[PDB]
Amino acid sequence: NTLTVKMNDALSSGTGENIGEITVSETPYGLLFTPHLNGLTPGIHGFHVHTNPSCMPGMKDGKEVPALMAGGHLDPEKTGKHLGPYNDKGHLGDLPGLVVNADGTATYPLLAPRLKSLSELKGHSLMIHKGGDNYSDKPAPLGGGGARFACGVI
Amino acid sequence: NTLTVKMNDALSSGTGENIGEITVSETPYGLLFTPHLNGLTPGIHGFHVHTNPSCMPGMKDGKEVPALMAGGHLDPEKTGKHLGPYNDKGHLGDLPGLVVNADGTATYPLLAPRLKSLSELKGHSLMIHKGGDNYSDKPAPLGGGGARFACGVIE
Numbered sequence: 001n002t003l004t005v006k007m008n009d010a011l012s013s014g015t016g017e018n019i020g021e022i023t024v025s026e027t028p029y030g031l032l033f034t035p036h037l038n039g040l041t042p043g044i045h046g047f048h049v050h051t052n053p054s055c056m057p058g059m060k061d062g063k064e065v066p067a068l069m070a071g072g073h074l075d076p077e078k079t080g081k082h083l084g085p086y087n088d089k090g091h092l093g094d095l096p097g098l099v100v101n102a103d104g105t106a107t108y109p110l111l112a113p114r115l116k117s118l119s120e121l122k123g124h125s126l127m128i129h130k131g132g133d134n135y136s137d138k139p140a141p142l143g144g145g146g147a148r149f150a151c152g153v154i
Numbered sequence: 155n156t157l158t159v160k161m162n163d164a165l166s167s168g169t170g171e172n173i174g175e176i177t178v179s180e181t182p183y184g185l186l187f188t189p190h191l192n193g194l195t196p197g198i199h200g201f202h203v204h205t206n207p208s209c210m211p212g213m214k215d216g217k218e219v220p221a222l223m224a225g226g227h228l229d230p231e232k233t234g235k236h237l238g239p240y241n242d243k244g245h246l247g248d249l250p251g252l253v254v255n256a257d258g259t260a261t262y263p264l265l266a267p268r269l270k271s272l273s274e275l276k277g278h279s280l281m282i283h284k285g286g287d288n289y290s291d292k293p294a295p296l297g298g299g300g301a302r303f304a305c306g307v308i309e
């Protein structure tokens with residue numbers, strides 16, 4: 001049982017290059033996200049599930065913002081707080097930071113214990129930000145992920 | 155709720171330099187291993203709990219092998235299979251691969267959902283191998299961790 005999520009670079013002018021795909025599976029402890037991607041800045045990237053089934057860019061006060069139409073972080077309990085994949089009090093869509101190797105690839109598997117079923121990701125999207133994620137709204141909001149680099153509807 | 159384990163480079167002649175410590179904490183989802191290490195090769199390293207409370211070098215077939223006395227991967231139900239930290243059918247000691255940044259540091263926290271109490275780690279050891287870990291015995295046995303680079307013992 002799997003979900004193959006294709007990921008594409010998000011541009012302010014639209015959808016860019018494909019950079020691989022992410023395969024999600026169920027384990028006795030939660031959903032496992034096993035990436036197979038390339039062309040990413042080495043390091044740890046914010047990685048979250050967003051509300052809307054779209055990666056389309058959008059205008060914000062007159063400026064085009066990449067993958068803006070994705071909406072915010074999946075948060076069916078309107079917590080309104082970014083606390084990470086290990087805190088039952090924040091965004092349910094908060095996944096562990098994506099690990100990007102030194103050669104630009106991402107292969108390290110990520111476990112999101114709070115997510116249990118493949119039906120929970122239906123009608124949403126997976127996002128990879130430019131920045132990292134400190135699993136909090138301080139000092140920088142939303143973990144400090146900043147701009148949206150790549151996105152997948154799934 | 156916390157546990158600290160000092161890690162030391164493993165050499166054939168004995169215990170080497172200290173490279174920091176790993177703090178283990180209990181969470182509603184299992185044991186969390188938060189490393190504070192340095193002096194590792196960038197990338198992903200095999201990271202597992204080993205049976206024996208020892209990091210001393212041993213010898214096997216003509217050579218001195220670093221931290222050999224630590225024994226094998228903690229496997230209570232003698233599965234004999236290295237399936238990773240999310241598979242109940244393998245080594246209970248199988249932790250997620252250790253993430254080492256580009257500057258040789260290790261800080262990325264690792265969650266091992268299969269362990270729920272600090273007590274389960276008592277009388278064992280934590281191991282950091284030279285190679286990675288694909289959570290399988292194929293193509294290479296034991297996720298391909300290979301040689302033992304650093305080790306720490308525990309109560």
Ligand SMILES: [Cu+2]
Pocket residue numbers: 046047048049050073127129145
């Ligand atoms: Cu996000």
Ligand SMILES: [Cu+2]
Pocket residue numbers: 200201202203204227281282283299
């Ligand atoms: Cu090992």
Ligand SMILES: [Zn+2]
Pocket residue numbers: 048073081082083084090091093094142
């Ligand atoms: Zn969030």
Ligand SMILES: [Zn+2]
Pocket residue numbers: 202227235236237238245247248296
């Ligand atoms: Zn193992």
